[PDB]
């Protein structure tokens, strides 16, 4: 059951269709890699949910009230105030997006422990329930090795579990020790756990993760692109919070980190925006230090690469993103897609918040090892219906990512029928 | 089969849900007349497709570039130019909406036949394939009787037919002769035919109509609210035009009127806007005359009650409304609604462009006819799913009118499921007195 | 002294320049009537402050959140609520603009006194401190004579006076008695007094007027286009109110009418919008009656010809229009214009809220009166600087009406410099016949 | 003479005023540094013209037509096409702003010459007519020393000259040699020369600069924040181009660089945006390489940190920014401010494109050496009128920077009267 949209549609961007002849030539042209296809050659564009979604009327309003002031803008304060009421975090630095909160927090947090505890850079390891590609990429650019301490269940697309994104507690505790605490610059808590497919992390797990971090005085950065979807799964699956509001769960949730880095272009539903925030005074020093570096990289920490409107809009998106009907609707669409695909013998991970991971390796096991299974299917899937999706042994899963409030159930049915044509011609 | 939207969604307005308890109070409080329910209390609002539907990004962008000049705005010129390229019509008066062009043309065209052909005001009768409520209303306010000359097939929710909107040609020809051609102030060609349930009028019919009117020198006005939908139907059903484009079909169509009066709030997709345009120099007089009256009623005829951005927006709206993928999708969503309802045994009219019309008389057969049954169905549909629909003897059909690019196949299902529950319960359903 | 704008500028519309040669052709081609010049050909457009002026960011943002529901929109409710908090008025009908509330209230209030007090339609006369063109026009279309009861000072561009807008109180009292109180359908309290050049009407005057009307049970309608400007003048000039806020002055003011009809296109700063509101339950009847007529003329009385975003926008417009820094700046820019012109020897009326009125009769003294001299001045001002101004015997004053937050002290200077060149050349200036 | 605005005003952001009492407490609070004052405490905000200006109706329209597509957006192409027609440059990479085109071009250009010609990083020097603070800052972060080869006239606020931003040709030629060509990773041509006050660079100078760069095969990056104002001065002051249109002059101008880096938040009048573009195939390799690094830092090179709308808007701002009446108006306002200030004995640099540099050192020569002359005056200037301006021996000039189409002549007169009060109480 696809829930009815708890909204009226208001502004649409028209899309043209393409001949089968035409997409063949597009797919060679951007040579066997959907990633480099032209937007206009794509009907249903599932490359990513990042910044590709609808906004609300209020968000659109918000864009028209920007204070474009270089230092100390009222729009900066409007944004910082949303962060205060939602996460209860006293310190806000806007950034243009995630890719860029990371470029700041990471060198600061390494320098910090370096000064205060003799972190040895050649020996430093950071931890996460699972590092996102950018978070990882940037950790390594700063010379920091990373380890994922996820739970045995997480990538096993064959079995179901309520919070597959959780931290392996034994593993994190032992990692920290084998490495030494002085050389762990930070732990990142990814909610939802993006890389296992948007698999959520429960409150009980976050609390216990934070007890360990506390015991060794390791900063905890909450990677919050999909903070709202995570809350919804907690409301839906964790017995103790069944009656909590999403806001209430967010506030409890964020007690178990020291700071947050967020690409706003996901759950907070903005075409553009990011946040790097600190909870309290204990981190004022880090906040000061991240301000300096934000200057160099984004621009003055009162806009941090955002125009006025963007800050006004984000200040509103953080609310609209947490709407209960909204989440229930968004999450069920994904769930409906996945259900739809399981029902025709296309094996998928457990449905997460924002995307449907098809185990491409299983759909075409005759298409061999080192011939990139998903890529091949993704190419075919584009060839048949004008559907763009990408994939980037753990698991090679093709990744149907759903922009928020963008496509309808008819589109979901459309992805389904296409897959049925692919599967039913997969002997190639 | 519901076609997939040919559009990414871009802006959404959130809607909150209500509880049966609350809706029981709302409908009492808004005296058993869905019409007077508040927006907030309504989940799916099927009251009207007038001004209730999505705009495209280009339209929204157009609202940002209005020339607010009080006389001779470029935006007015932008609007006039679309009318020329689309309908081939030389003369243009923006008005705030349909209700408002009608207020102008009606008195002017009655005055004209008074002076020119000696019209008897107290004998006068205007003709149409079927007059819309506001067109009737206004015709009547200026003292003019109205007569609908539809074909027997039109309101018959039993048989199907390619163009139920057509003018009953003999009937029109006869009425004109029976009444006196001098006392016929005008003919209104309503396209699509609203009241029949959005049924099309074919080109061939419009040619034959126009000929009758030319034979008597009767101005013909094209009521143009749903011109795009009509063209689409002409292209789907009229053999002669299968390979034409919606634009070319629209150009060809307007050869068979003398002027157009348009609620731009329907097919042109705008929250506000209307038009009053004349075709060529033969009607320069009426145009001048209509300008004078517009000043009085709407404002200087170079904005006619519209802000700059609205003229800009309509200038774009006229184009996007004609999009082939767009119309095919729109018309198809409505068809899907009708098919879903017929399939659960709810007898509808033949699916038109914009709305499913439900024979409330049939779904609820024991409800005495004089206890307005469609009203009762309406109230019931609200109590059950928070869907607003309204009815206002050819019939009393409850009218499910779909706003454009607003609701999804999921909402359609919802509306169907609700009717399935309403049908399952007809025996406890409440007449209304 | 021109105060500095209390605002950063945010969006600009570029304007191209023209050459004397080109303007010589434009004004011929648009038959020596600046009125019919195209927007594009005009550098400074001083035709009207109606709908031609800047909006604030909040207003523009408001346009993005319209509830396009056809009945009971939240935006309608947002609008009604501002009217309650601002004017203290319980009943609200959006209309597309002033022209459009007038069309409603006039017939309703004539019908009322016909039935209730036995009004003679062919004897009836409406009164005002001074009736605006469209108010006159409409009053007259429904068969009602109009009489202006201004004080001798009003049009006298010689002496100054704090409130030239005032009702000639004896005159009103007498006219009512002279005509029969039964045949007085209504009194219109126009604030500020447009035709006098935007001159204020004081609270004390409005109290004394309202008393006369209460003595005869005559509905009083507040013509409210420039209510904000009036309040500002009351605060600057009326001793009693120096320490009041514009809002409190507005609340106090509206105690002395029964209903308001407003072109929101002026002080409320919106490109489009109007209002028709009644004060309390004593006028519930008229309100109901006005609703019915609005359906017919503007549309269902819950949008009354306005899109959702317009209701949202006006809901905000009413507030921002009352800003103290805003008004002081606005009123001061006009004053600066007047002072610049008097200083180069161009005799103006006393500076009102929105416009400088230039005594074209005096600047050009040998131009025979019957060769419309203000027109000729207008045409001349266009030939010389590409400034559009218009005139439409108490006078023939050319009317330089300044759109809000649109032009700068630099444009004011420009307008002055042009008049300095026009005065320098009066002997070769062309009468017009 | 202040030219009349060649525009009607359309949307205004209201501003409140403040008591003298109140600004005293604001100025201590953000302790003796206007830079950190709250936007709402500022009436006339001249901290910078960067992203603080009006937009046109068409730009605002443009924001409503974004294609928010992650890869290959039609808005990306719309933007790249403006760059093509205006500068004639085949390669476009959007970036969120200037600060960030620099973070890319610089390491790429150093690596390039390092591979191809044995640049020695410990010996590398880059050149410019004058390096902007960010361009410099980022050159140094990558270990690159910088030298300015400006002409003797440039900072001498006492004398006037038609193109004070020009490259010292002898100096650049000799620098290159003393350093060795293999260790000059790039030359940056700043138009206008921001740091000498917006002093323009003539076409003849750019042509001859480029002949030298050619002779030694050194990449030339045109730092183009104020490309349009520069064109206008060329049209106004260089005999040979009196009759050229601004577009025509821009096209000629850009023949004398290999690539461009631009903060769009200045002449192109966008609240947000940047460009890193390459002229032709000879630089395709650099373009490819800058794409990669843009991924890491801004996001995919098809948006590069910009939302759809931003790209649409920039694609339009690059035109609207070059409008002839617009420039003549903007430049004369500055000129009018400056004139106004010279006329009351406040000594200023020659008026540039975008800002008025007051020689603070001269206005208060009793306020000593190491007590930051401008800071002190800027504090006072804020204390008196609610005017924010900042200053960051060469020259210590307080820097009144005018946002585009934001303030009116009455505001200019207002800055003037304030300065008259400051000057006339400067014995403190």
Q: Which domains does chain D have, with CATH numbers?
A: 1-56+323-428 (3.90.1150.10), 57-322 (3.40.640.10)
Q: Which two tokens stand for residue B353?
A: 């462009």
Rounded Cα distance between A106 and A110, Å, is 6
- Do residues C265 and C271 touch, judged by C-beta distance below 8 A? yes
Going by the DSSP 8-state scheme, the letter that residue C156 receives in this structure is: -
Show residues of chain B in contact with A416, CB under 8 Å.
none
Q: Which two tokens stand for residue C130?
A: 């001074």
- Do residues C76 and C94 touch, judged by C-beta distance below 8 A? yes
Report phi then psi at C387, rounded to 5.
Answer: -110, 130
Rounded Cα distance between C354 and A310, Å, is 36
Sign of CA dihedral B392, B396, B398, B404: negative
- Do residues A142 and A125 touch, judged by C-beta distance below 8 A? no
Rounded Cα distance between A207 and A201, Å, is 11
Are D411 and C5 inside 8 Å of each other by CB?
A: yes
Rounded Cα distance between B272 and D56, Å, is 25
CA distances from A181 to A131, A175, A187 (A): 19, 9, 11
D42 contacts chain A (CB < 8 A): yes
Rounded Cα distance between D293 and D275, Å, is 14
Q: Which two tokens stand for residue A42?
A: 């794509």
Rounded Cα distance between C261 and C105, Å, is 8
Burial class, A90, CB count within 10 angstroms (exposed 0-12 / middle 13-18 / buried 19+): middle
Rounded Cα distance between D285 and D112, Å, is 9
Rounded Cα distance between A298 and A315, Å, is 19
Strand ranges, E, within C342-389: 355-359, 387-388
Count the Cβ atoms, other than its own, within 10 Å of residue B140: 14
Element (H, E) at B145: strand B145-148
Count the Cβ atoms, other than its own, within 10 Å of residue D36: 14
In angstroms, the separation between the Cα of residue D334 and the nearest Cα of chain A is 20
Interruptions in chain A after residues (C–N over 2.5 Å): 392
| Nearest one of A87, A111, A99 to A277, comparing CA atoms | A87
Element (H, E) at C125: strand C125-128
Reported resolution in A? 2.9
Long-range contacts of D331-334 (CB under 8 A, 24+ apart): D331/D229, D331/D232, D331/D233, D332/D1, D332/D2, D332/D3, D333/D2, D333/D3, D333/D402, D333/D409, D333/D412, D334/D198, D334/D402
Q: Nearest CB to C11: which of D6, D55, D410?
A: D55
**Helices (H), ranges, B64-183:** 74-87, 98-117, 133-141, 169-179
Count the Cβ atoms, other than its own, within 10 Å of residue D296: 15
To the nearest 10°, report the CA torsion of D233, D237, D239, D244. Answer: 30
Q: Which residue has the tokens 């017009």?
A: C432
Rounded Cα distance between A87 and A268, Å, is 13
Rounded Cα distance between B66 and D58, Å, is 10
Q: DSSP secondary structure string, B175-200?
A: HHHHH-GGG---EEEESSBTTTTSB-
Strand partners, A223: A190, A261
- Do residues B266 and B286 touch, judged by C-beta distance below 8 A? no
Going by the DSSP 8-state scheme, the letter that residue C49 receives in this structure is: S
Burial class, C1, CB count within 10 angstroms (exposed 0-12 / middle 13-18 / buried 19+): exposed
Q: Nearest CB to C9: which of D3, D57, D406?
A: D406
Residues contacting A411, CB < 8 A, separation 6+: A44, B4, B5
Going by the DSSP 8-state scheme, the letter that residue C43 receives in this structure is: S
Are C14 and D407 inside 8 Å of each other by CB?
A: no
Rounded Cα distance between C13 and D7, Å, is 5
| Nearest one of A94, A39, A69 to A317, comparing CA atoms | A94
- Do residues C410 and D2 touch, judged by C-beta distance below 8 A? yes
All chains having 3 or more CB pairs closer than 8 angstroms to chain D:
A, B, C
Q: DSSP secondary structure string, B252-290?
A: HHHTT-SEEEEETTSTT--SS-EEEEE-SGGGHHHHHHH
Show residues of chain A in contact with D48, CB under 8 Å.
70
Burial class, A366, CB count within 10 angstroms (exposed 0-12 / middle 13-18 / buried 19+): exposed
CA distances from B84 to B77, B89, B248, B356, D264 (A): 10, 5, 13, 33, 39
Are C42 and B298 inside 8 Å of each other by CB?
A: no
User: In a mutagenesis test of the C interface, which of B45, B71, B100 is the best target, namely the one with the most C β-carbons within 10 Å?
Assistant: B71
Residues contacting D29, CB < 8 A, separation 6+: none
C7 contacts chain D (CB < 8 A): yes
Rounded Cα distance between B306 and B298, Å, is 9
Are A47 and D71 inside 8 Å of each other by CB?
A: yes
Residues contacting C73, CB < 8 A, separation 6+: B39, C66, C67, C302, C303, C308, C311
Going by the DSSP 8-state scheme, the letter that residue A350 receives in this structure is: P
Strand ranges, E, within C36-104: 44-45, 55-56, 91-95
Q: Is B269 left (phi over 0), alpha (psi -120 to 50) or beta?
A: left
C356 contacts chain B (CB < 8 A): no
SS3 C201: coil
Show residues of chain B in contact with A320, CB under 8 Å.
14
B3 contacts chain A (CB < 8 A): yes
CA distances from D243 to D18, D200, D236, D252 (A): 48, 18, 9, 13
Report phi then psi at D331, rounded to 5.
Answer: -60, -35
C-alpha neighbours within 13 Å on the C-beta side of residue A332: 16
Q: Which two tokens stand for residue A261?
A: 């880095």
Q: Which residue has the tokens 């074909």?
A: B151
| Nearest one of B384, B366, B362 to B427, comparing CA atoms | B366
Strand partners, B8: A13
Rounded Cα distance between A28 and A47, Å, is 18
Rounded Cα distance between A381 and C404, Å, is 57
CA distances from C336 to C326, C355, C405 (A): 15, 11, 15
B61 contacts chain C (CB < 8 A): no
Rounded Cα distance between B44 and A7, Å, is 9
Element (H, E) at C189: strand C187-190
Q: Which two tokens stand for residue D122?
A: 């410990």
Interface contacts A/C by beta carbons within 8 Å: 21
Rounded Cα distance between C222 and C241, Å, is 20
SS3 C199: strand
Q: Is B335 left (phi over 0), alpha (psi -120 to 50) or beta?
A: alpha
Rounded Cα distance between C149 and C151, Å, is 7
Q: Which 101-140 residues of chain B touch chain C by CB within 8 A?
A: 103, 134, 137-138
Sign of CA dihedral C241, C245, C247, C251: negative
Rounded Cα distance between D274 and D98, Å, is 5
Are C409 and D407 inside 8 Å of each other by CB?
A: no
**Helices (H), ranges, D119-266:** 133-141, 169-179, 203-216, 227-237, 246-254
C-alpha neighbours within 13 Å on the C-beta side of residue B20: 2
- Do residues B53 and B403 touch, judged by C-beta distance below 8 A? yes
| Nearest one of A307, A339, A227, A262 to A99, comparing CA atoms | A262
Burial class, C215, CB count within 10 angstroms (exposed 0-12 / middle 13-18 / buried 19+): exposed
Rounded Cα distance between B94 and B66, Å, is 14
Q: Nearest CB to A12: which of B7, B407, B411?
A: B7
CA distances from D318 to D58, D331, D354 (A): 12, 17, 17
- Do residues C172 and C187 touch, judged by C-beta distance below 8 A? yes
Going by the DSSP 8-state scheme, the letter that residue C193 receives in this structure is: B
Q: From the centroid of its chain, how far is CA A306? A: 20
In angstroms, the separation between the Cα of residue D238 and the nearest Cα of chain C is 25
Rounded Cα distance between D114 and C12, Å, is 48
B58 contacts chain D (CB < 8 A): yes
Strand partners, A126: A146
To the nearest 10°, report the CA torsion of D51, D56, D58, D60. Answer: 50
- Do residues C50 and C265 touch, judged by C-beta distance below 8 A? yes
Chain A residue with Cα closest to C69: A8
Strand ranges, E, within D63-158: 91-95, 125-128, 145-148
SS3 C352: coil
Rounded Cα distance between A262 and A246, Å, is 18
Residues contacting C213, CB < 8 A, separation 6+: C187, C219, C220
SS3 B49: coil
| Nearest one of C46, C1, C49, C7 to C353, comparing CA atoms | C49
C-alpha neighbours within 13 Å on the C-beta side of residue A235: 22
Rounded Cα distance between D342 and D350, Å, is 10
Going by the DSSP 8-state scheme, the letter that residue A193 receives in this structure is: B
Going by the DSSP 8-state scheme, the letter that residue D285 receives in this structure is: H
| Nearest one of B374, B383, B364, B384 to B426, comparing CA atoms | B364
Strand partners, B399: B357, B390
A60 contacts chain C (CB < 8 A): yes
SS3 B133: helix
Q: Nearest CB to A68: which of D66, D138, D271?
A: D271
Report phi then psi at C193, rounded to 5.
Answer: -80, 95
Are C71 and B37 inside 8 Å of each other by CB?
A: yes
- 3-state helix, strand, coil split of chain B in percent (to 5) is 45, 15, 40
Q: DSSP secondary structure string, C234-293?
A: HHHH-GGGTTS-HHHHHHHHHTT-SEEEEETTSTT--SS-EEEEE-SGGGHHHHHHHHHH
Show residues of chain A in contact with C65, CB under 8 Å.
57-58, 61
Element (H, E) at A98: helix A98-117
């Amino acid at each position: 059951k696809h829930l009815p949209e708890p909204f009226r549609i208001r502004v649409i961007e028209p899309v043209k269709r393409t001949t089968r002849a035409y997409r063949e030539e597009a797919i060679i042209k951007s040579g066997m890699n959907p990633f480099l296809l032209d937007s206009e050659d794509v009907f249903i564009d599932l490359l990513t949910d990042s910044g590709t979604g609808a906004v609300t009327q209020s968000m659109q309003a918000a864009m028209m009230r920007g204070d474009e002031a270089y230092s100390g803008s009222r729009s900066y304060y409007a944004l910082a105030e949303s962060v205060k009421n939602i996460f209860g975090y006293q310190y806000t630095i806007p950034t243009h997006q995630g890719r860029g909160a990371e470029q700041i927090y990471i060198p600061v947090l390494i320098k910090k422990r370096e000064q205060e505890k003799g972190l040895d850079r050649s020996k430093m390891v950071a931890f996460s329930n699972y590092f996102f590609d950018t978070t990882q990429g940037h950790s390594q650019i700063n010379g920091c090795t990373v380890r994922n301490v996820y739970i045995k269940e997480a990538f096993d697309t064959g079995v179901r579990y309520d919070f597959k994104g959780n931290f392996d507690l034994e593993g994190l505790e032992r990692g920290i020790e084998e490495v030494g605490p002085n050389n762990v610059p930070y732990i990142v808590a990814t909610i939802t756990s993006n890389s296992a497919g948007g698999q959520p992390v429960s409150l009980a797990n976050l609390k216990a993760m934070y007890s360990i971090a506390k015991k060794y005085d390791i900063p905890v950065v909450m990677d919050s692109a999909r903070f709202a979807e995570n809350a919804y799964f907690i409301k839906q699956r964790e017995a103790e919070y069944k009656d909590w509001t999403i806001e209430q769960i967010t506030r409890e949730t964020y007690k178990y980190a020291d700071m947050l880095a967020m690409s706003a272009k996901k759950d907070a539903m903005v075409p553009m925006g990011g946040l790097l925030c600190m909870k309290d005074d204990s981190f004022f020093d880090v906040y000061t230090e991240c301000r300096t570096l934000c200057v160099v990289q984004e621009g003055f920490p009162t806009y941090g690469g955002l125009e006025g409107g963007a800050m006004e809009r984000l200040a509103v998106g953080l609310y609209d993103g947490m709407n209960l009907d909204w989440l229930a609707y968004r999450i069920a669409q994904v769930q409906y897609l996945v259900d739809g695909l399981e029902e025709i013998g296309v094996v998928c991970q457990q449905a997460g918040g924002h995307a449907a991971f098809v185990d491409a390796g299983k759909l075409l096991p005759h298409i061999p090892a080192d011939q990139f299974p998903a890529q091949a299917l993704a190419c075919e899937l584009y060839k048949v219906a004008g559907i763009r999706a990408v994939e980037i042994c753990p698991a090679e899963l093709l990744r149907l990512t759903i922009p928020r409030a963008t496509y309808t159930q008819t589109h979901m049915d459309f992805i389904i029928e296409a897959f049925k044509h692919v599967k039913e011609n997969a002997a190639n």
